[PDB]
């Protein structure tokens, strides 16, 4: 409602770097807010795409940002009569970024890995890797839970059980308030998808450079399955955390699996031991239900609510015709131990091929009325197809079904404006939570500052 679309702030990265593909707010040890931006096609030392991360200090005028440097060199370790190899070419560093406390986690989901042993090998595959930084101290750590040292023959003999070779760890990421990093790995267990969790503190204290294959004992990975409903489900394409079991000592996981059960799609809520508490099934095959997930209490009852995006949902129209527009689903959490019912609200896009619901950002309480609000991105929506972000205000019954405000992309065609969103942080310290919108196709990020309400809705 009260985001200012007149005076924006623009940050920009190098051309072709996909700056803005992922972003997050970052607070330093003094509570000063900055913006961390992933640029997954930033050039590296060998003039080859490797990805990069930028840490943007808040400035009303925006501009260029300093790099957050990570080791971009391929590594080789000859140990235990084996050769361990990391491959960082086209790894997509910055394809996801997240901030927790004074730590930044930037992941390279397509970093490759191989183990050589005489004439045999593990196979050069995208296990993924995440890079951890404490910018103020310069500390660096890595986390790559799907690296193994098993040879190809063994996986074949065992019918590819517990095959983590194609995890793409860090595809999606989130950090619990207690500091547990939770990585989505949609390619884990031969494209079933897995989750990898470990405390940030333990990642740092157990990492040393050059080891390549080390133990993080407090880590916890999800489980394999023989059930074909999970095959090629990309469980972990998106991840989120929240409180859904009423016990405040446990943290619950929200996992998106947009191709679950032959592309029907699903979203699952789990406890920290990966036991399934709820499953929300998609409504329409290939709609990519679970592409994006969001957790926030929208109706002010203290209980977290779930939002699910299905950006390829095809809406039914006259004369038995379908129109791909995208859809968002709202599930209000019921009082006490009960199942999430049918959706409380359906939000459906209007622009053909707009992909409404590709990203969903909690905004906090934007208009300061007592109910939390959300922003939904249609990265190719709007009457011009340039991209659009729509704000929906919370209310006692859930959300308003019509948007209170629409942000039209200030960028040219193809910018994918909205593909990444983050809100609920006051970056200029004016008392209102603000919104950052990435447009990786234009290699830019737009900052929308919230201002006092003109008059309320």
């Amino acid at each position: 409602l009260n985001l200012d679309p007149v005076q924006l702030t623009f940050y920009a990265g190098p051309n072709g770097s996909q700056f803005g593909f992922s972003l997050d707010f970052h607070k330093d040890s003094h509570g000063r807010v900055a913006i961390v931006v992933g640029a997954p096609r930033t050039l590296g030392p060998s003039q080859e795409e490797t990805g990069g991360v930028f840490l943007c200090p808040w400035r009303a005028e925006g501009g260029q940002c300093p790099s957050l440097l990570f080791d971009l060199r391929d590594e080789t370790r000859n140990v235990g009569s084996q050769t361990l190899q990391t491959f960082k070419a086209r790894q997509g560093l910055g394809a996801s970024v997240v901030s927790w406390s004074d730590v930044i986690v930037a992941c390279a989901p397509w970093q490759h890995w191989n183990v050589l042993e005489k004439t045999e090998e593990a196979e050069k595959t995208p296990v993924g890797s995440c890079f951890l930084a404490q910018p103020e101290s310069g500390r660096r750590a890595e986390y790559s839970p799907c690296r193994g040292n098993t040879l190809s023959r063994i996986y074949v003999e065992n019918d590819f059980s517990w095959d983590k070779r194609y995890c793409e760890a860090g595809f999606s990421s989130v950090v619990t308030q207690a500091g547990e990093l939770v990585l989505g790995a949609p390619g884990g267990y031969y494209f079933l998808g897995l989750l990898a969790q470990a405390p940030v503190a333990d990642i740092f204290s157990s990492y040393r450079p050059g080891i390549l294959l080390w133990h993080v004992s407090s880590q916890s990975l999800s489980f394999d399955s023989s059930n074909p409903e999970y095959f090629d489900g990309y469980w972990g394409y998106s991840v989120a955390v929240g409180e859904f079991d009423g016990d405040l000592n446990t943290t619950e996981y929200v996992v998106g699996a947009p191709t679950w059960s032959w592309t029907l799609g699903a979203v699952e809520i789990l406890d920290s031991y990966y036991q399934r508490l709820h499953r929300l099934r998609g409504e329409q095959m290939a709609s990519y239900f679970g592409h994006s997930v969001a957790v926030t209490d929208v109706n002010g009852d203290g209980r977290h609510d779930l939002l699910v995006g299905a950006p390829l949902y095809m809406e039914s129209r006259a004369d038995r015709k379908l129109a791909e527009v995208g859809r968002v689903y709202l599930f209000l959490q019921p009082r006490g131990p009960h199942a999430l019912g049918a959706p409380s609200l359906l939000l459906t896009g209007t622009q053909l091929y707009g992909r409404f619901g590709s990203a969903i950002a909690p905004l906090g309480d934007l208009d300061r009325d007592g109910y939390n609000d959300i922003a939904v991105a249609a990265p190719y929506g709007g009457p011009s197809g340039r991209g659009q972000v729509l704000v929906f205000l919370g209310q006692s019954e859930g959300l308003r079904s019509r948007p209170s405000q629409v942000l039209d992309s200030p960028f040219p065609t193809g910018s994918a404006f909205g593909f990444s969103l983050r809100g609920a942080v006051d970056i200029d310290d004016n008392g209102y939570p603000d919104l950052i919108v990435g447009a990786y196709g234009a290699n830019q990020v737009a900052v929308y500052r919230a201002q006092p309400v003109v008059k309320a809705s």
């Epitope: 000859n78 140990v79 157990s206 133990h215």
Partner: antibody
Framework: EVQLQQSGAELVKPGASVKLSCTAS????????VHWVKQRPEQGLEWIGR????????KYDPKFQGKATITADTSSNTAYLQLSSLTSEDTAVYYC????????????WGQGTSVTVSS | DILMTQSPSSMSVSLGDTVSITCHAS??????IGWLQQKPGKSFMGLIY???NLVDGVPSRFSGSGSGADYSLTISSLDSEDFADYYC?????????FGGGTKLEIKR
């Protein structure tokens, strides 16, 4: 806290067999490689072999092929070292080892199990 | 098999001294070396892994160095407990192999 608790001292006769145990305390035996090392005063320290208790795959020094058989039971969180056709030169202290962080390192050691082979 | 020549077999030193134990391998092992301590009549304790990294809980007066085929364990300002046996172990190749050892003895 990681602790590797090994079985009590053994006193056996030549030609017989013995099975030493190494039970994990404060951690899951399935987490890391588990090695077995032999120590004698003159001959020093010799690496016998290792096992991955998660899957049972083993590796040995060819010197110990035939005499040493390393197994593991994740249910009881224990790793074993079976020695067969015992001789006087099998009289030694035997340690089970696991790494801290580096997959291939040798950092945590059990207290050792003394083996004495005599008629 | 990789031969580990550890030198010296023994040394008679005093409290507060800064001593160094070397280990020479028959071929390159690129820091894939560990250092071990065995106090008299007791079991082993890890000191160093991967050439330079202190095992959790080891005092910083211990430090490892070296590259290629030559490495060193250095104890700065010896303590009373530091008088014990020390061994190196390579894990660059299977089978793992150990050094002959080094016993730190009190000088008088």
């Amino acid at each position: 806290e990681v602790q590797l608790q090994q079985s009590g001292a053994e006193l056996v006769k030549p030609g017989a067999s013995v099975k030493l145990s190494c039970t994990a305390s404060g951690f899951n035996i399935k987490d890391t490689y588990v090695h077995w090392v032999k120590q004698r005063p003159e001959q020093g320290l010799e690496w016998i072999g290792r096992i991955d208790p998660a899957n049972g795959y083993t590796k040995y020094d060819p010197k110990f092929q035939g005499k040493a058989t390393i197994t593991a039971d994740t249910s009881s969180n224990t790793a074993y070292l079976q020695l067969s056709s015992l001789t006087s030169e099998d009289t030694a202290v035997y340690y089970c080892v696991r790494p801290l962080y580096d997959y291939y390192a040798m950092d945590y050691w059990g207290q050792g199990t003394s083996v004495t082979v005599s008629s | 098999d990789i031969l580990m020549t550890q030198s010296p077999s023994s040394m008679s030193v005093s409290l507060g001294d800064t001593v160094s134990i070397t280990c020479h391998a028959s071929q390159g092992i690129s820091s894939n070396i560990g250092w071990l301590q065995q106090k008299p009549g007791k079991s082993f304790m890890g000191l160093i892994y991967y050439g330079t990294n202190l095992v959790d809980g080891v005092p910083s007066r211990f430090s490892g160095s070296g590259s290629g085929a030559d490495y060193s364990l250095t104890i700065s300002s010896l303590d009373s407990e530091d008088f014990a046996d020390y061994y190196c172990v390579q894990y660059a190749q299977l089978p793992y192999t150990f050094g002959g050892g080094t016993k730190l003895e009190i000088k008088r």
